[PDB]
């Protein structure tokens, strides 16, 4: 809260808590299906964790996905947007428009780490390429935020796609500079 | 503290030490050595009928315990001398 | 409600909005209730099935607690708990410091007759009791170091006549980050806020004074907006500060 | 308005050219004269917590305030040329605190066209030196944080620390 | 003239408020500066026997009315930014002493076991007393309604289960809620990160 800043803006670990507050799909390893000890969650449903069967799709928090292939009854399947092709749409896409932000979702930059980190067996892909397209469309990213800090004011900006790591890393100088800008103008009324 | 029960049972710490441990080492203290959670058993163990099923009676022992440990400086490592502040406990009752 | 996820959900939503706000939010006085219930009556489950498995263990040398279908669940309410509790914490520790920053504001508040902001519905109950310790605590300190060799003519830690105003206020006009949710719900024609524009999703409207425009929020985008324009949308949970 | 601000206290101390519009005895240790009396129509440079009260209280106030030198024509012509490039800390330590104060002791909207354009064009050079996180495998950096006023190196401070904790937690194995 | 000196306290301030910006791990106060302080307490008692010696001149009547605004006014002005200056510091060396108190979990800080972040004879005497009321009133808070949630507990969000820890400092066996750990120097543990977080925060252990 009060010791190292922290006042009002978060830390990385803190958005990295909040992407894996997400749900996920997985393939479970195991079978818990009720006869013919429960988990009694209280924060998250356990209806999908309850009813589990072997070779079969389910869905859960990330978290969850994460400790159970700590052991070896988890498989955790990327999303879709985690592929060559879907990337390199994106990237042309991110081309062609130098004026508008691509739709990723909100979580990418920290989801990819995070996958990459614990579940590299999992992709498909070969991961040094899907690491090179990551940083490709990063660096574009940051050419266009660049430009487009020049139309700094006082009255109010808008940045419809940008994700929540890019608005954490920018966000203390944004504010202060158009809050400073905003008590030059209302000194002069 | 009290008398006139059964008897002394004698019981080993290791179904003692989880209450003592949630008393003090969670809340407020800390370091309950080994030494120091035997010695801990006899007291305990000296009004020993009827309980660890009971309301508040360990509860109020272990607060008890801790009352010395904020009066007194001391330290953080609990030893032999466990007995040696419940004796100054029954000089203050 | 009636929902255990939602109770999250809910707490989530009032801590972001808590961190990146200028001043002090009201207290949501029955989600904590709730939450801390839960809390209790789950640590004593934990604590339950603990002790039942540790005392049939020592009985007659039995087997632990057989590996399958046991460890993970057990682990996952322990590392659940610790979670939620960390996240109540860092709300709590965090509102305790803003309640620091504004004691003299909060003060001159409870002053005020003619005032509908009262501490019995922004302040909690132990937050109450910080305050009056902490005042009265720093009055002390100031009072012993520094005021009492001052005059008469100027003794008072609140002075809003000299030359420099002594009592702080929030700032309400702080640029913040913002993401238009829409309706709390649905049912976007019931919202009377809600108006369509052109060839795109109905957006909301609102005006800055000092600057006399009229600015449309369009449903899905980020915006960075003055605190003030935006106060209704984020108390009826229309806006979520990102 | 920050009874509590450090920053505020130090740039409200700063000395303004003014000149005395009354004959009044008894002063003097304004002038380091002790016991002789001020005259009338005497230039001095007094603090602003001083000088701001004393031009209000009468009407004609006791004290007129003279233009301060870091607002003359040549600071704003050279504001105006060549914004990054100025060395605003040789100036003043204090430059932008003590502008919003006086555009709002003097309602001045010239002064306010050139400050934000100012703050505007250094805020692009202040983000391009914060955002260069060095890679281990310039003496621009030096030269530019030793122009800058107490105020910006707050900014760039934070910059800088929120670019390296990102970049920390992005490649942390 | 007169607030010449108390500026060069705020400066001193100033110079605190880097060593708490630049600060990887916590610091401990400079010196208190109760020369200086003295002195602006001096200073201000002159003022006002200055303002009462005006009061009585002005009232048998030898002096005009705008004449003595005048000087009256410099010097409620000056008392006023003594006043401003002292405040400042007080209230900086105020906070940073806040801080340190809720970074000890709770305690009573020098009176028990101490970090050792500060020496008892940097903070003055009612800075010393008011750090004592600050670590009770902490201490009654954690008492409260939240007695489950510990208010003085880690502020890292918990993203690992099993940690790997190293000792630091030997010590003697340690019971913990259903089992021992045996504290050898230069020995390596494999355990739940739940346990450790308080033995860590204390010095016993390192890394997580």
């Not at chain 1, 209280?42 to 969850?64: F, G, H, P, Q």
């Not at chain 1, 004026?99 to 920290?110: A, H, K």
């Not at chain 4, 003097?28 to 009338?40: A, F, S, V, W």
């Amino acid at each position: 809260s009060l010791p190292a800043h922290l006042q009002q803006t978060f830390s990385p670990e803190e958005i990295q808590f909040i992407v894996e507050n997400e749900p996920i799909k997985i393939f479970p390893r195991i079978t818990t299906r009720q006869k013919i000890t429960r988990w009694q969650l209280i924060t998250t449903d356990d209806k999908a964790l309850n009813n589990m069967v072997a070779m079969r799709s389910t869905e859960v928090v990330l978290w969850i996905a994460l400790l159970l292939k700590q052991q070896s009854k988890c498989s955790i399947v990327a999303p879709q947007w985690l592929t060559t092709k879907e990337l390199d749409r994106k990237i042309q896409y991110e081309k062609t428009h130098p004026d508008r932000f691509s739709e990723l979702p909100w979580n990418w930059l920290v989801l990819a780490r995070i996958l990459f980190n614990k579940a590299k067996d999992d992709f498909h892909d070969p991961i040094h390429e899907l690491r090179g397209k990551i940083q490709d469309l990063r660096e574009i990213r940051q050419i266009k935020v660049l430009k487009g800090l020049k139309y700094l004011n006082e009255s109010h900006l808008q940045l419809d796609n940008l994700s929540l790591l890019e608005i954490n890393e920018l966000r203390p100088f944004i504010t202060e500079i158009m809050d400073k800008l905003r008590e030059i103008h209302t000194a002069s009324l | 503290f009290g008398s006139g029960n059964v008897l002394p049972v004698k019981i080993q710490p290791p179904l003692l030490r989880p209450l003592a441990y949630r008393v003090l080492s969670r809340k407020y203290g800390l370091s309950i050595k080994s030494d120091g959670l035997s010695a801990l058993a006899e007291f305990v163990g000296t009004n020993i009928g009827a309980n660890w099923r009971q309301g508040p009676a360990t509860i109020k022992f272990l607060e008890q315990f801790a009352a010395v440990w904020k009066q007194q400086e001391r330290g953080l490592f609990i030893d032999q001398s466990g007995v040696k502040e419940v004796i100054q406990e029954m000089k203050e009752r | 409600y009636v929902s255990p996820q939602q109770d999250f959900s809910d707490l989530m939503k009032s801590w972001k909005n808590e961190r990146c706000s200028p001043e002090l939010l009201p207290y949501p006085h029955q989600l904590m209730k709730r939450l801390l219930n839960r809390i209790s009556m789950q640590s004593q489950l934990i604590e339950n099935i603990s002790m039942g498995f540790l005392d049939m263990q020592n009985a007659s040398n039995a087997n632990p607690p057989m590996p399958n279908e046991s460890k993970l669940p057990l682990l996952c309410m322990e590392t659940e708990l610790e979670r939620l509790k960390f996240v109540i914490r860092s709300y709590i520790r965090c509102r305790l410091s803003k309640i620091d920053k504004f004691s003299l504001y909060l003060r001159q508040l409870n002053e005020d007759e003619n005032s509908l902001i009262s501490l019995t519905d922004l302040l909690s109950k132990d937050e109450i009791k910080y305050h009056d310790t902490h005042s009265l605590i720093w009055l002390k300190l100031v009072n012993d170091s520094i005021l009492k060799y001052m005059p008469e003519e100027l003794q008072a830690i609140n002075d809003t006549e000299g030359s420099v105003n002594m009592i702080d206020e929030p700032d309400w006009n702080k640029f913040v980050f913002i993401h238009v949710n829409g309706p709390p719900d649905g049912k976007w024609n019931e919202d009377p806020l809600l108006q369509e524009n052109e060839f795109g999703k109905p957006c909301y409207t609102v005006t800055i004074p000092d600057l006399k425009e009229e600015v449309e929020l369009t449903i899905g985008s980020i915006y960075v907006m003055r605190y003030e324009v935006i106060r209704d949308l984020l108390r009826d949970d229309k806006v979520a500060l990102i | 308005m920050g009874y509590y601000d450090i920053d505020d206290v130090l740039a409200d101390g700063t000395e303004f050219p003014c000149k005395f519009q009354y004959d009044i005895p008894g002063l003097g240790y304004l002038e380091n004269n002790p016991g002789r009396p001020i005259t009338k129509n005497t230039k001095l440079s007094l603090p602003l917590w001083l000088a701001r009260i004393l031009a209000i209280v009468g009407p004609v106030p006791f004290v007129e305030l003279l233009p301060p030198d870091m607002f003359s024509t040549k600071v704003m012509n050279a504001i105006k040329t060549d914004p990054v490039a100025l060395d605003l800390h040789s100036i003043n330590s204090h430059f932008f605190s003590l502008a919003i104060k006086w555009i709002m002791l003097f309602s001045e909207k010239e002064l306010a066209n050139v400050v934000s354009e100012l703050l505007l064009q250094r805020a692009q050079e202040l983000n391009h030196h914060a955002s260069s996180l060095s890679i281990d495998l310039n003496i621009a950096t030096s030269t530019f944080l030793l122009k800058l006023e107490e105020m910006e190196k707050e900014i760039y401070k934070k910059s800088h620390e929120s670019y390296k904790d990102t970049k920390r937690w992005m490649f942390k194995k | 003239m007169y607030g010449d000196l108390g500026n060069k306290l705020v400066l001193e301030a100033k110079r605190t408020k880097q060593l708490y910006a630049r600060s990887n791990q916590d610091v401990n106060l400079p010196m208190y500066h109760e020369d200086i302080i003295r002195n602006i307490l001096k200073e201000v008692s002159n003022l006002r026997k200055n303002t009462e010696y005006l009061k009585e001149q002005q009232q048998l009547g030898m002096l005009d009315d705008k004449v003595a605004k005048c000087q009256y006014f410099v010097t409620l002005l000056c008392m006023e930014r003594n006043k401003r200056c002292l405040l400042a510091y007080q209230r900086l060396r105020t906070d940073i002493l806040d801080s340190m108190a809720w970074n000890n979990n709770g305690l009573d800080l020098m009176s028990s076991i101490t970090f050792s972040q500060q020496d008892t004879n940097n903070l003055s005497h009612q800075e010393q007393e008011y750090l004592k009321e600050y670590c009770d009133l902490i201490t009654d808070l954690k008492s409260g309604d939240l007695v489950d949630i510990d208010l003085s507990g880690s502020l890292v969000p918990p993203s690992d289960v099993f940690i790997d820890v190293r000792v630091l400092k030997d010590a003697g066996e340690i019971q913990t809620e259903y089992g021992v750990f045996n504290l050898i120097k230069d020995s390596q543990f494999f355990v739940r990160q739940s346990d450790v977080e308080r033995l860590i925060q204390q010095g016993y252990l390192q890394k997580i």
